Design a protein around this ligand. Structure first.
Ligand SMILES: CCCCCCCC/C=C\CCCCCCCC(=O)O[C@@H](COC(=O)CCCCCCCCCCCCCCC)COP(=O)([O-])OCC[N+](C)(C)C
Ligand SMILES: CCCCCCCC/C=C\CCCCCCCC(=O)O[C@@H](COC(=O)CCCCCCCCCCCCCCC)COP(=O)([O-])OCC[N+](C)(C)C
Ligand SMILES: CCCCCCCCCCCCCCCCCC(=O)O[C@@H](COC(=O)CCCCCCCCCCCCCCC)COP(=O)(O)OCCN
Ligand SMILES: CCCCCCCCCCCCCCCCCC(=O)O[C@@H](COC(=O)CCCCCCCCCCCCCCC)COP(=O)(O)OCCN
Ligand SMILES: CCCCCCCCCCCCCCCCCC(=O)O[C@@H](COC(=O)CCCCCCCCCCCCCCC)COP(=O)(O)OCCN
Ligand SMILES: CC(C)CCC[C@@H](C)[C@H]1CC[C@H]2[C@@H]3CC=C4C[C@@H](O)CC[C@]4(C)[C@H]3CC[C@]12C
Ligand SMILES: CCCCCCCCCCCCCCCC(=O)O
Ligand SMILES: CCCCCCCCCCCCCCCC(=O)O
Ligand SMILES: CCCCCCCCCCCCCCCC(=O)O
Ligand SMILES: CCCCCCCCCCCCCCCC(=O)O
Ligand SMILES: CCCCCCCCCCCCCCCC(=O)O
Ligand SMILES: CCCCCCCCCCCCCCCC(=O)O
Ligand SMILES: CC(=O)N[C@@H]1[C@@H](O)[C@H](O)[C@@H](CO)O[C@H]1O
Ligand SMILES: CC(=O)N[C@@H]1[C@@H](O)[C@H](O)[C@@H](CO)O[C@H]1O
Ligand SMILES: CC(=O)N[C@@H]1[C@@H](O)[C@H](O)[C@@H](CO)O[C@H]1O
Ligand SMILES: *[C@@H]1O[C@H](CO)[C@@H](O)[C@H](O)[C@H]1NC(C)=O
Ligand SMILES: *[C@@H]1O[C@H](CO)[C@@H](O)[C@H](O)[C@H]1NC(C)=O
Lengths: 1080, 162
């Protein structure tokens, strides 16, 4: 009856046979569209899986939750196929659930997922605190911005066909040249500005089919979840700063500081604790230099190949390759003489070197003609031969070899989940992408990104794991409706991020395994002398911010600054020639800081001679090095610069390996795409001709009867290794990568017009780059940074290396009635305190109900609610005054809140004036909700999760001040160089270098990687003469219009490097404090 | 990128002078058929004629030509004019009545913006007042700042003696 069952169930072939069966099912369901056999195969597998159920359920069955899936899927399928029911589309969806069986059928993955789901219960606190903060900031967002994005330029005075989903109302509203939505504008001085003959009005639809708005709760929470991911944010900043003033930019800074930094550091620190909690529970031999030189030259010969390339150097590189195989095939048949080869093929490296010599004597005889070009792609493998001599590469690779047995399961689980999500998405949404294609794309064709087939859905999932989700989710909601699309995307985002980050932590864990002399020597050191020159240093720094385009309009100020520069240089000269009196001449140059001061005195001297002669005027640019004087003046900066040197310079040793991998990928690109990105365009509209009209270049340059045509290159291309590195850097930051990938997948051959999506499989190149060149090296750097941070934390102890010795005492202080007015015995009661909290909560929930479109009977019934709440607060304040000081700080905050609330609800005595804006009082009352973080008066986990910010405020203050000084230097230098650039692409009416404010907003969105490519593509206006070298600019002494690519590239690359290195340390500072508190 | 700035209203015998005049467009993106007219400048009826712009430059066909030069920008955003060897007779108001027209292929709006400046060609320009008062203030400050140090390297020196 139930005896023989075991002899099947535990024999290993009953496992292997079903594993094979599932892999057949999931391949034939997905990587194939071959029909006329799908009515035979499914009726077979419905036999096998029923043999599985009718075996396994006799031995035991519901004791393991995986058996609920196995039974509940197959019983539903069996109810379908043979009964009158026929929900055929739903049947094929459920079968995709079988893919998940790979988890329980592989005990390793079953246990890994078991311990991961067990440890998931540590997160509940952070998830609630995050949703709490998102709710508060989305109420604030509804306060500041509700309704603003309906603003447009309305034609005034009013006077008396196609794809229906793209008609524009251009008779009534004003549109830019190519944009889909009307121009945003606002009444404020610094908002957008109407063209002449238009007036600002609130009318019609929001952007983005309505999905981008703050007009209700819900969508505001969508916007804040978008900002927390900081996914494609810069268009939202542009829209808000066009609908309202630049002053509102403070909001997005605060939001990105709280959410994109602190919360993510809490999640990362908790998962990094859970990982260790889990882990604790478990004949010419010597002559070599010749051959290493005959490696490095071979490396260099590979890099010189580019496009175009004349035959008289092609034959050079061809002989070079032949010569080097004429060396390697000598040395092999030297080493195969060491008595025998049975040691030769025993050592691990030679079972690679002999592959190199076999490849290099394939591609020389009968693979020269009629052979496939990708055979040459393997030539790059030669650079790894350099690794034989290089201990760092060897010991990293050895550290990877050690960890193999563990990483296997995490990689296989992640691949399983990607494949499941891809299949389930293809079956759930695929049909809609073609039934309603006309909403998604004009001319009614499938776009580049969709879900209509398995490969595009796979790419869409990999993209969601990279981020980028919002721009596809808009099309999902536009095509399939929101209630289906939202749960799918949110599932993929959450479980994806969890797996990706747990794998990142696993990699990091793997890798980590004459008395005048005494006079001057006193005058130099009295503290007043220090503070005076410090003040002069900050004055001499801040005065550079005034040199914007309005310099000639501020006619008076210029003359004052013109003399102030000479005052400042005089003071610094009498500083220098005093120190040399005091310290002794030689001891001045011994000390590194005074050397930097001396360089700044030279900058001041050169700057003042240069402006006296026109031929030396370029010297006046030198003064932008002045801010460097701050760095050596103030004690707080020096400790930070030393902590960055102490922590980050030792990473140089491993950085060369990452540069080697990037060089490998760059050559691997130059070989495969160079010269093929050329295309033939309409010279006015920039769109391409179709391949049917102008197949090759010869028609792109016809004999003048019809030549409305231009042949030109593409801004980003792989024509040589130096463009390769830049395109790779642009891929690595996920900025503009989609334009490169579109170029790649469209490309045919050197002189052939590129055609839409011909070799779609090239996405493997960028997938492989994203895996091996970015993700692994990044952790290879972070593990070294952490190892030195621990080293120094042990070499002296100390709260941090980022704080001055005075601040350590602050750190250690911070870490630490009778006259029948019996109201004292009442106001103290828990019963009163809980009531106060219930009031605060009700007032916030009674604020969530508000919406933009709203009937007056509701608006007044919200107004009298907020008035009742101000009455209750005033009554409790009056009662509190009987049981009694203004000594408690929170009791000052509450009394300020009450005064400000009434002086707003009633304004000036409830009749006095206007322009106190409605919904100010709501935010005033809302501010009290901060009480729900105090120790004795709220959920204890919110305090325990906020404690790291308290215990780390000083180091963050120091680091923020250094980031601000660096942003100041780069702002001034960019404000001097890139003004007057023609407005284009990512240079517009809000982000530009016209003034210090806009330059700071540019450098901010650069630091967050919110589209630096859109600025670089504007600086490259000279790349095809889209500019006017001599244009007069009104009101200004500067003629011309041109960027300079060579300076642009250097500027952006250096700023990105420095910012990333600082921000990484800023993350470390928080994560290690969380991990220190969590020790107890 | 455009900036609007007043003109100098002061001119020196025996030199040219530039009468700058700037009128920004609220949107830099659009295009407009500009017209520019400069008025007569005399102690009777000022409106008479100076140098008009229609589709190409034209001539004043009166006696206020020859000592004139077009110094305006290529796109007519700026319409500055230079007068040559200003003489004592030259004096009083100048007026520039620019006007523009836009074409959005729906409604054709028209806007007009006057701009007017006096000038007097004084016998010779005196020095600017600000650029001497500020040089006094600078030299005074640099005297004080160099007696202060000396006072210190008296007091401290005397203290160090012992
Ligand atoms: C109908 C299909 O509608 C359905 O039949 C949906 C099936 C519901 C299954 C939900 C389980 C989610 C997987 C949990 C994953 C756990 C991951 C575990 C980690 C490895 C068509 O929809 P329409 O055409 O829009 O109408
Ligand atoms: C000097 C005195 C001593 C100071 C040095 C000591 C410090 C040295 C150590 C460290 C300094 C630098 C730290 C690396 C941080 C990069 C972060 C990043 O890109 O994001 C990714 C990580 O990036 C990587 O995986 C690393 C690869 C960086 C190579 C960039 C070269 C682009 C050149 C373009 C050339 C174009 C030419 C065009 C010509 C036609 C992931 O996000
Ligand atoms: C399309 C959804 C948007 C519309 C509606 C939004 C509604 C609000 C959603 C409420 C979310 C509350 C928690 C938010 C946590 C976000 C995770 C996070 O950002 O923290 C870190 C990452 O998160 C984690 O490490 C932990 C995440 C685990 C949280 C959930 C555990 C498993 C829950 C599975 C349940 C399945 C849900 C099914 C839908 C009902 C930082 O990484 P990053 O996103 O900044 O960098 C991106 C790199 N590619
Ligand atoms: C022993 C002590 C251990 C203590 C641990 C403490 C850890 C300290 C924390 C250090 C702070 C780290 C700063 C940022 C961490 C987040 C890094 C990450 O998870 O992903 C990055 C990796 O970059 C990416 O490429 C994201 C997309 C990756 C695709 C995932 C697919 C790869 C999976 C295939 C596995 C095969 C691996 C090969 C195995 C041999 C994304 O960078 P970003 O956009 O968040 O940068 C911030 C922007 N200003
Ligand atoms: C650990 C973090 C703590 C979380 C708890 C936060 C709870 C605090 C909530 C209090 C928010 C304080 C904002 C008060 C600013 C008042 C905004 C306002 O309405 O100003 C009026 C005056 O206009 C101005 O903009 C003046 C300059 C104020 C703008 C400042 C915006 C930045 C606000 C920063 C939000 C961050 C607050 C949380 C800080 C932790 C706008 O009237 P309007 O007529 O122009 O608009 C309607 C016309 N259609
Ligand atoms: C000092 C005043 C005047 C300006 C504000 C200084 C500090 C707080 C500013 C300047 C640069 C800003 C940072 C710029 C980039 C990032 C990376 C992002 O992933 C999280 C936010 C974060 C970390 C910002 C936090 C706020 C920030 C650090
Ligand atoms: C309809 C799709 C559902 C898919 C998920 C089904 C539930 C899987 C649960 C697995 C739990 C693993 C842990 C078991 C207990 C342990 O080992 O601690
Ligand atoms: C932790 C789960 C939170 C889920 C929150 C989902 C909020 C996003 C969806 C907002 C939908 C708003 C109403 C849609 C219909 C409309 O536009 O009128
Ligand atoms: C491609 C990457 C090349 C890696 C080849 C190196 C061989 C690994 C084994 C190290 C030598 C030790 C041994 O085999 O005794
Ligand atoms: C956590 C799941 C939330 C789902 C929200 C779907 C919103 C539907 C609006 C119609
Ligand atoms: C204005 C340019 C940006 C400057 C950014 C860095 C500012 C550093 C401020 C340091 C404060 C030091 C306080 C003590 C000074 C003293 O002893 O007089
Ligand atoms: C760590 C060293 C890097 C390893 C190199 C990985 C190889 C990836 C290159 C794949 C090329 C795919 C091109 C598709 C065209 C068919
Ligand atoms: C969107 C918006 O409010 N624009 C306003 C407009 O409504 C108002 O009529 C005009 C004159 O006051 O000022 C501007
Ligand atoms: C005052 C002034 O600068 N006038 C100039 C003029 O001297 C010069 O000949 C001309 C060149 O286009 O530009 C105008
Ligand atoms: C200097 C002087 O007296 N007059 C100047 C001179 O440059 C010029 O030649 C003259 C007309 O000839 O008008 C003006
Ligand atoms: C493409 O070039 C070939 C020769 O290389 C030529 O025969 C053909 O006509 C060209 N295609 C055109 C002109 O469309
Ligand atoms: C320019 O403007 C007025 C417009 O009324 C015009 O009639 C006259 O010619 C000029 N007058 C002034 C004061 O600018």
């Amino acid at each position: 009856i139930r005896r023989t069952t075991i002899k099947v169930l535990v024999h290993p072939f009953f496992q292997l046979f079903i594993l094979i069966s599932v892999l057949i099912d999931c391949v034939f369901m997905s990587l194939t569209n071959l029909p006329k056999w799908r009515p035979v195969l499914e009726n077979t597998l419905l036999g096998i899986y029923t043999f599985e159920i009718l075996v396994k359920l006799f031995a035991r069955f519901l004791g393991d939750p995986w058996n609920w899936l196995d039974f509940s899927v197959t019983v539903f399928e069996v109810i379908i196929r043979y009964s009158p029911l026929d929900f055929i589309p739903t049947l094929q969806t459920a079968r995709t659930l079988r893919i998940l069986k790979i988890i329980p059928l592989n005990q390793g993955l079953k246990s890994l997922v078991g311990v991961l789901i067990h440890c998931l219960k540590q997160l509940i606190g952070v998830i609630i605190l995050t949703l709490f903060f998102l709710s508060i900031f989305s109420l604030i967002g509804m306060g500041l911005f509700m309704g603003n994005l309906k603003h447009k330029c309305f034609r005034w005075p009013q006077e008396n066909t196609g794809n229906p989903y793209y008609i524009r109302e251009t008779e009534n509203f004003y549109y830019l040249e190519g944009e889909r939505y009307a121009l945003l504008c606002g009444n404020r001085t610094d908002a957008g500005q109407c063209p002449e003959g238009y007036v600002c009005v609130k009318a019609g639809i929001n952007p983005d089919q309505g999905f981008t708005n703050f007009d209700s709760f819900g969508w505001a929470l969508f916007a804040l979840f978008r900002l927390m991911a900081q996914d494609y944010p810069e268009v939202l900043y542009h829209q808000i700063l066009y609908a309202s003033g630049k002053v509102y930019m403070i909001f997005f800074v605060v939001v990105s500081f709280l959410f994109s930094f602190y919360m993510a550091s809490l999640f990362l620190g908790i998962l990094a604790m859970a990982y260790e909690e889990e882990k604790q529970r478990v004949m010419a031999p010597f002559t070599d230099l010749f051959l290493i030189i005959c490696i490095i030259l071979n490396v260099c010969f590979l890099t010189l190949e580019h496009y175009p390339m004349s035959k008289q150097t092609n034959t050079l590189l061809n002989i070079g390759n032949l010569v080097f195989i004429g060396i390697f095939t000598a040395e092999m048949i030297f080493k195969i003489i060491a008595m025998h080869p049975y040691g030769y093929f025993q050592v691990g490296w030679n079972i690679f070197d002999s592959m190199i010599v076999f490849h290099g004597l394939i591609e020389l005889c009968l693979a020269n003609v009629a052979g496939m070009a990708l055979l040459r792609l393997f030539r790059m493998l030669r650079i790894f031969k350099l690794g034989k001599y290089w201990p760092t590469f060897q010991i990293l690779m050895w550290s990877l070899s050690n960890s193999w047995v563990a990483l296997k399961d995490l990689v296989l689980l992640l691949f399983t989940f990607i494949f499941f999500s891809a299949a389930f998405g293809m079956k759930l949404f695929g049909k809609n992408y073609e039934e309603f294609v006309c909403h998604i794309d004009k001319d009614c064709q499938l776009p580049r990104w969709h879900m209509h087939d398995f490969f595009h859905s796979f790419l869409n999932v990999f993209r969601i794991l990279c981020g980028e989700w919002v721009e596809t989710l808009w099309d999902c909601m536009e095509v399939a409706g929101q209630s289906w699309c939202i749960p799918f995307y949110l599932m993929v985002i959450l479980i994806g991020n969890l797996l990706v980050l747990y794998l990142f932590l696993a990699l990091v864990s793997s890798f980590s395994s004459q008395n005048i002399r005494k006079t001057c020597c006193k005058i130099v050191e009295n503290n007043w002398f220090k503070c005076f020159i410090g003040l002069v240093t900050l004055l001499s720094t801040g005065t550079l911010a005034f040199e914007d385009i309005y310099m000639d309009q501020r006619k008076t100020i210029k003359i004052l600054l013109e003399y102030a520069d000479m005052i400042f240089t005089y003071i610094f000269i009498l500083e220098m020639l005093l120190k040399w009196m005091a310290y002794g001449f030689k001891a001045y140059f011994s000390n590194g800081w005074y050397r930097l001061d001396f360089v700044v005195v030279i900058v001041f001297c050169l700057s003042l001679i240069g402006k006296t002669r026109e031929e030396l005027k370029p010297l006046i640019s030198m003064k932008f090095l002045r801010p460097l004087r701050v760095l050596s003046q103030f004690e707080r900066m020096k400790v930070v610069v030393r902590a960055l040197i102490k922590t980050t310079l030792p990473t140089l040793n491993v950085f060369l390996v990452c540069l080697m991998i990037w060089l490998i990928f760059s050559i691997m690109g130059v070989d495969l795409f160079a010269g093929r990105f050329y295309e033939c365009i309409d010279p006015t509209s920039g769109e391409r001709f179709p391949s049917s009209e102008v197949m090759n270049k010869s028609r792109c340059e016809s004999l003048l009867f019809n030549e409305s045509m231009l042949w030109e290159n593409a801004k980003m291309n792989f024509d040589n290794v130096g463009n390769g590195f830049l395109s790779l850097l642009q891929v690595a930051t996920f900025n503009g990568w989609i334009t490169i990938m579109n170029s790649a997948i469209d490309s045919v051959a050197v002189n052939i017009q590129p055609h839409f999506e011909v070799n779609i499989y090239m996405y493997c190149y960028f997938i492989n780059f994203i895996i091996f060149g970015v993700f692994l090296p990044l952790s290879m750097l972070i593990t070294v940074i952490i190892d030195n941070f621990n080293k120094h934390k042990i070499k002296l102890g100390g709260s941090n290396i980022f704080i001055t010795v005075k601040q350590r005492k602050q750190y250690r202080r911070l870490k630490k009635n009778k006259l029948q007015g019996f109201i004292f015995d009442v106001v103290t009661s828990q019963a009163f305190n809980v009531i106060v909290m219930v009031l605060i909560c009700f007032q916030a929930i009674a604020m969530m109900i508000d919406t933009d479109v709203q009937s007056l009977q509701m608006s007044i019934a919200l107004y009298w609610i907020n008035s009742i709440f101000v009455m209750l607060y005033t009554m409790e304040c009056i009662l509190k005054l009987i049981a009694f000081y203004f000594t408690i700080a929170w009791n000052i905050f509450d009394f300020m809140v009450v005064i400000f609330s009434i002086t707003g609800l009633c304004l000036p005595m409830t009749v006095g004036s206007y322009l106190v804006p409605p919904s100010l009082v709501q935010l005033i009352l809302l501010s009290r909700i901060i009480h729900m973080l105090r120790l004795g008066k709220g959920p204890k986990v919110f305090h325990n999760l906020m404690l790291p910010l308290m215990l780390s405020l000083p180091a963050l203050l120091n680091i923020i001040l250094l980031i601000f000084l660096v942003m100041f230097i780069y702002a001034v230098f960019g404000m001097y160089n890139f003004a007057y650039v023609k407005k284009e692409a990512g240079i517009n009416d809000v982000s530009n270098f016209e003034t210090f404010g806009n330059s700071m907003l540019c450098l901010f969105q650069v630091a967050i990687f919110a589209g630096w490519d859109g600025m670089l593509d504007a600086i490259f206006n000279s790349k095809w003469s889209d500019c006017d070298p001599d244009k007069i600019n009104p009101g200004t002494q500067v003629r011309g219009d041109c960027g300079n690519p060579s300076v642009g590239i250097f500027y952006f690359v250096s700023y990105i490097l420095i910012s990333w290195l600082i921000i990484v340390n800023m993350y470390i500072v928080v994560v290690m404090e969380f991990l220190n508190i969590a020790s107890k | 990128v455009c900036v609007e700035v007043p003109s100098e209203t002061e001119a020196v015998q025996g030199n040219p002078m530039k009468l700058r005049c700037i009128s920004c467009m609220k949107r830099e993106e659009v295009e407009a058929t500009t017209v520019v007219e400069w008025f007569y400048r005399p102690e009777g009826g000022k409106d008479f004629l100076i140098y008009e712009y229609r589709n190409g430059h034209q001539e004043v066909e009166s006696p206020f030509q020859g000592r004139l030069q077009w110094n305006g920008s290529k796109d007519l955003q700026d319409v500055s004019i230079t007068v040559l060897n200003v003489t004592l007779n030259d004096s009083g108001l100048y007026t520039c009545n620019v006007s523009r027209e836009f074409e959005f292929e729906a409604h054709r709006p028209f806007v007009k913006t006057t701009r007017l400046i006096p000038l007097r060609v004084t016998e010779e320009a005196g020095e600017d007042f600000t650029s001497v008062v500020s040089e006094i203030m600078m030299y005074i400050l640099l005297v004080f700042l160099t007696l202060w140090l000396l006072i210190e390297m008296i007091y401290c020196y005397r203290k160090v003696s012992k």
